């Protein structure tokens, strides 16, 4: 598996606008909401769960990087894998998207896969 | 279990106004006091205790997040489970609430379960 | 044991003014000095040693919180247990106080046991 | 092995201009892009991958240091070992360079193996 | 062993002016360069290696404290043990000094052993 697999999805020129931390099934988790830097479009919601999914190994690195980009407000590309989380009330509150990567973006491109 | 279980309680549009770190019965712990951003209501107190209660796995994540939201003064939703801590002097100083989640808030919503 | 045990000692309305990190007996340790926010009184010195005393489990949380309050310069209540450290040159440089808690203070009260 | 081995390569007077975090083949990784502080030259890209390559033990220290130098934007010397990553889509997006060291370039010259 | 052993050396009122992170013999390490706050004298260089020397246990605490003092620019007392590192190209680049402690300094005296 790789963040950049074309079976994942990504959204460019976004800003992390909200942050949530909690616990589910004895696992810490966090979620972020991102919006376009220009405010257009629909928010992207993605979560990472410390003990669950093939992306569990990257939990701490992604939590620290989400916190960093949240604090700076800078433009990023957010990479997700769709249809991962399945607890129905959790998906209703957040989404089924697993967070799988974060890339900084300049005005002309983003530093990350496609 | 989940932060968003309907048997937990939550308080929206709160500001983390105080922070305390200590040790009890071999466990580092922290407590926070939150107050409504608009001055309404009565303060909420919640604590997380390392290696104690079902919420133990998220101790470090919640401590780091509470420190961040405390440092910014931003409005948050605080999620608790009531009647968890039983040590009587501790409860009298702080409360029996276990901290189980923290959510950022916007002008119209908070980014977490309700 | 608890930070708030009345056999411990505390000092309100203090500012963390100095910070030292070192090693002793293969254990990382740190010490702080605090002074009254209003400039009066006698400084308080307290140390924490990663592998020593009943307070060892809280070493990392107290170090992070000491660094936080040191960086903000805000007024705090410092909680200690007297007569813990015993190596004479160490006590002469610093003190025998073990650090056991740190509480934020407002103008009127401190958020911690009293 | 050593960061300063002559078989490694380095680039002075660079600024960390982009940062990416993801996961590949069970491993969290990060990549950085650096450009000459004075605007000349060609960017350098380097990556560190947890639990992969001989440089695995320093993954967390290099991630933390890359973040710090990225946040200040100060001039640095980046140390790499060429031709380490072989995953072809990854190399095309980023590079085959393993990040093996970071040195400040305050004042006089770069504070690292030369 | 202790940071304050009289067989160690220390240098007061120093400013951390450079920082380097790398790897050697499968161990992360860092080095700092310090200079007197008034610019007199000659620089002090010291390094910490995570898996080597009796000071290995305090590697992370020292790296975190070095980063903090490097970012503030405040005057510190640096404590070292001489003639510890032995790889010749490493010693010639940096020094043989092991970093063994870091103390903040008031306007009149440093907060650590002397
Ligand atoms: C490397 C390469 O060949 N092309 C990339 C390319 O991805 C991208 O070009 C377009 O740039 C605009 C704004 O910069 C958008 O980025 C475009 O749409 C994308 C995006 O956000 O990147 C593409 C993405 O695949 C889409 N994801 C899904 C699930 O559909 C999203 C999504 O539709 C929207 O984001 C929702 O609002 O849109 C993109 O085509 C740029 C980006 O920097 O860089 C090129 O090099
Ligand atoms: C390929 C695909 O999309 N899904 C398959 C699916 O056939 C199946 O799903 C998993 O199987 C059982 C229940 O049938 C597990 O209980 C998983 O449920 C949980 C889990 O405990 O792991 C419940 C948990 O609440 C979920 N966490 C959240 C935040 O929602 C997790 C989580 O979605 C997964 O762990 C993510 O990978 O799932 C259930 O998903 C199994 C059977 O082979 O395989 C899937 O791939
Ligand atoms: C994987 C592991 O280590 N432990 C899981 C364990 O988490 C799981 O417990 C369930 O976890 C879910 C979240 O994933 C909920 O927190 C459940 O709370 C319940 C409850 O226990 O009463 C269940 C569910 O949320 C609801 N009722 C159901 C499914 O019947 C109610 C809730 O009030 C709703 O509002 C009504 O829909 O709360 C909790 O049971 C257990 C059981 O799946 O499995 C372990 O593997
Ligand atoms: C009438 C009047 O106003 N007298 C003032 C008085 O307000 C004040 O006394 C101190 O006030 C602070 C208020 O935060 C504390 O209540 C001090 O009590 C404590 C403390 O919390 O710091 C109690 C504690 O048990 C004591 N610790 C030990 C080991 O004995 C400490 C300690 O004695 C002092 O902190 C050391 O300086 O005191 C209370 O003493 C002061 C000035 O504000 O003195 C009068 O002017
Ligand atoms: C030989 C000499 O000159 N002095 C030693 C003295 O160092 C030491 O004192 C006592 O030893 C018993 C156990 O033998 C206690 O454990 C205490 O020792 C130590 C310890 O646990 O290592 C010594 C250590 O230096 C102390 N650490 C600091 C920072 O001061 C700790 C510490 O106070 C406690 O751990 C706190 O709970 O205590 C001490 O009572 C012994 C060495 O055999 O004998 C003297 O002669
Ligand atoms: C203790 C442990 O876990 N592993 C060591 C292992 O690190 C050590 O390897 C030597 O490490 C030193 C630094 O301490 C040098 O990096 C040596 O590097 C070499 C190199 O990597 O190529 C070896 C030799 O000196 C030269 N190259 C060879 C023989 O291929 C070059 C040359 O000096 C540089 O180019 C200088 O610019 O450096 C490395 O062998 C081994 C052997 O000491 O012992 C393990 O236990
Ligand atoms: C003034 C003139 O005529 N030409 C200058 C030229 O002298 C100068 O070259 C660079 O100067 C800097 C000074 O810090 C470095 O010394 C560069 O050396 C190194 C470097 O450390 O960056 C050495 C290193 O071994 C080289 N790495 C590799 C893989 O070969 C790098 C690398 O070639 C360059 O960094 C790539 O751009 O160079 C030295 O080259 C500069 C002015 O600063 O450019 C001309 O104007
Ligand atoms: C508990 C563990 O894991 N290891 C300890 C080990 O740390 C300890 O070594 C002693 O540690 C103390 C600090 O706790 C000092 O660093 C000691 O240095 C001394 C020394 O050289 O012996 C100790 C003492 O203060 C003095 N020695 C005397 C009076 O004989 C000298 C002093 O500075 C003068 O220079 C002497 O003329 O410093 C160090 O030995 C050992 C022994 O306690 O126990 C292990 O278990
Ligand atoms: C004779 C003199 O002038 N000084 C000596 C010194 O040369 C000598 O070297 C030590 O001897 C041991 C014996 O096994 C090893 O050779 C040590 O090797 C290494 C190691 O641990 O791998 C090599 C390594 O590269 C070194 N790391 C760095 C950053 O340089 C480490 C490190 O220095 C030690 O671990 C420090 O504790 O050492 C080598 O140090 C011995 C002779 O006993 O000490 C002086 O007297």
Short mmCIF file of C-alpha atoms in Angstrom, two decimals, chain D:
data_model
loop_
_atom_site.label_atom_id
_atom_site.label_comp_id
_atom_site.label_asym_id
_atom_site.label_seq_id
_atom_site.Cartn_x
_atom_site.Cartn_y
_atom_site.Cartn_z
CA UNK D 1 28.04 4.07 8.86
CA UNK D 2 27.86 7.82 9.48
CA UNK D 3 25.96 10.82 8.14
CA UNK D 4 29.40 12.23 7.35
CA UNK D 5 30.65 9.28 5.27
CA UNK D 6 32.23 10.44 2.02
CA UNK D 7 29.92 8.04 0.16
CA UNK D 8 27.02 10.32 1.16
CA UNK D 9 26.20 13.64 -0.50
CA UNK D 10 25.22 17.03 0.88
CA UNK D 11 23.92 20.40 -0.27
CA UNK D 12 24.56 23.64 1.62
CA UNK D 13 22.68 26.92 1.95
CA UNK D 14 19.29 25.27 1.33
CA UNK D 15 15.85 26.05 2.74
CA UNK D 16 13.27 23.34 3.43
CA UNK D 17 10.42 24.52 1.21
CA UNK D 18 7.93 21.62 1.24
CA UNK D 19 7.03 18.74 3.57
CA UNK D 20 4.97 15.57 2.93
CA UNK D 21 3.94 12.76 5.30
CA UNK D 22 2.50 9.43 4.21
CA UNK D 23 2.78 5.66 4.49
CA UNK D 24 4.37 3.06 2.23
CA UNK D 25 4.64 -0.74 2.60
CA UNK D 26 3.59 -0.61 6.32
CA UNK D 27 5.94 2.31 7.10
CA UNK D 28 5.21 5.95 7.88
CA UNK D 29 7.57 8.13 5.88
CA UNK D 30 8.20 11.78 5.19
CA UNK D 31 9.83 13.68 2.34
CA UNK D 32 11.23 17.19 2.10
CA UNK D 33 12.04 19.45 -0.82
CA UNK D 34 14.83 21.99 -0.40
CA UNK D 35 15.82 24.91 -2.61
CA UNK D 36 18.84 27.18 -2.53
CA UNK D 37 18.26 30.05 -0.13
CA UNK D 38 19.40 32.48 -2.85
CA UNK D 39 17.00 31.06 -5.47
CA UNK D 40 19.57 29.42 -7.77
CA UNK D 41 20.00 25.76 -8.64
CA UNK D 42 17.74 22.72 -8.75
CA UNK D 43 15.65 21.49 -5.80
CA UNK D 44 16.86 18.57 -3.70
CA UNK D 45 14.30 16.00 -2.56
CA UNK D 46 14.96 13.47 0.20
CA UNK D 47 12.85 11.02 2.16
CA UNK D 48 13.07 9.03 5.35
CA UNK D 49 11.07 5.82 5.78
CA UNK D 50 10.38 4.27 9.18
CA UNK D 51 11.93 0.81 9.71
CA UNK D 52 13.47 0.86 6.20
CA UNK D 53 17.14 1.26 5.17
CA UNK D 54 20.17 1.49 7.45
CA UNK D 55 19.02 5.01 8.41
CA UNK D 56 15.80 3.72 10.02
CA UNK D 57 16.96 4.34 13.64
CA UNK D 58 17.06 8.12 13.14
CA UNK D 59 13.61 8.40 11.50
CA UNK D 60 11.91 10.17 14.40
CA UNK D 61 14.80 12.54 15.16
CA UNK D 62 15.07 13.56 11.49
CA UNK D 63 11.31 14.04 11.17
CA UNK D 64 11.32 16.31 14.23
CA UNK D 65 14.36 18.22 12.97
CA UNK D 66 12.96 18.58 9.46
CA UNK D 67 9.80 20.03 10.97
CA UNK D 68 11.78 22.50 13.07
CA UNK D 69 13.91 23.75 10.16
CA UNK D 70 10.81 23.83 7.92
CA UNK D 71 9.05 26.04 10.46
CA UNK D 72 11.90 28.56 10.75
CA UNK D 73 12.84 28.56 7.07
CA UNK D 74 16.49 29.02 8.02
CA UNK D 75 19.35 28.00 5.75
CA UNK D 76 20.52 24.41 6.28
CA UNK D 77 22.80 21.70 4.90
CA UNK D 78 20.89 18.59 3.87
CA UNK D 79 22.77 15.27 3.92
CA UNK D 80 21.53 12.39 1.76
CA UNK D 81 22.52 8.94 0.58
CA UNK D 82 21.65 8.52 -3.08
CA UNK D 83 19.87 5.58 -4.73
CA UNK D 84 18.26 4.03 -1.62
CA UNK D 85 14.51 4.00 -2.31
CA UNK D 86 13.60 1.75 -5.23
CA UNK D 87 9.78 1.79 -5.37
CA UNK D 88 9.44 3.30 -8.86
CA UNK D 89 6.30 5.45 -8.52
CA UNK D 90 7.58 6.75 -5.19
CA UNK D 91 10.95 7.65 -6.72
CA UNK D 92 9.26 9.45 -9.62
CA UNK D 93 7.10 11.51 -7.24
CA UNK D 94 9.89 12.23 -4.77
CA UNK D 95 13.39 10.76 -5.21
CA UNK D 96 15.62 7.82 -4.33
CA UNK D 97 17.58 9.92 -1.80
CA UNK D 98 17.55 8.81 1.82
CA UNK D 99 17.72 11.76 4.22
CA UNK D 100 20.63 11.11 6.61
CA UNK D 101 21.31 14.42 8.35
CA UNK D 102 20.42 18.08 8.78
CA UNK D 103 22.80 20.87 9.81
CA UNK D 104 22.17 24.52 10.61
CA UNK D 105 23.99 27.16 8.53
CA UNK D 106 24.00 30.03 10.97
CA UNK D 107 26.83 32.49 10.46
CA UNK D 108 30.31 31.24 9.39
CA UNK D 109 29.47 28.01 7.54
CA UNK D 110 27.45 24.81 7.89
CA UNK D 111 27.70 23.00 11.21
CA UNK D 112 28.13 19.48 9.94
CA UNK D 113 30.49 17.09 8.18
CA UNK D 114 32.25 18.80 5.35
#
